[PDB]
Amino acid sequence: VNQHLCGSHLVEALYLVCGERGFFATP
Amino acid sequence: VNQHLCGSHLVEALYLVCGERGFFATP
Amino acid sequence: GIVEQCCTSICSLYQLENYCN
Amino acid sequence: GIVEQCCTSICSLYQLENYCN
Ligand code: NA
């Protein structure tokens, strides 16, 4: 399995981990 | 003069500063 | 992260460049 | 930044959380 987090996967990982939270650059 | 960089203005600031380096979350 | 440093607070060019790549 | 740490290389949960907010 690929353990790199790029593009959409990286966005997906931040959604998961950051929660309420938020992160750049979600609207 | 607002010195805060939020949302789309922060994305622009990164386009300007990062140039060819790129940055998350632009392609 | 960058929102706290550059949006909530004011950040420098050096800090901003931290968030490239 | 987050791309070199998490995309080019492999990053931990702690590193990834540094890029929230
Ligand atoms: Na970032």
A25 contacts B11? CB cut-off 8 A: yes
Angstrom resolution of this structure: 1.5
Q: Is B15 on the interface with D (CB under 8 A)?
A: no
Instruction: Determine the longest span between alpha carbons in chain A, in angstroms.
Output: 31
- Report chain breaks in chain D, C–N > 2.5 Å, as residues after which they occur: none
Neighbours of D1 (CB within 10 A): 19
Helix and strand element counts for chain A (H, E): 1, 0
What technique was this entry resolved by?
X-ray
Closest CB to A23 among D7, D8, D21: D21
Which residues in chain C have Cβ-Cβ distances shorter than 8 Å to A24? Answer: 1-3, 19
Long-range contacts of B8-13 (CB under 8 A, 24+ apart): B10/A24, B10/A25, B10/C2, B10/C3, B10/C6, B10/C7, B11/A25, B13/C6, B13/C16
Burial bucket for residue B27 (CB in 10 Å: 0-12, 13-18, 19+): exposed
Q: Find the closest chain B residue to C13 by CA distance.
A: B17
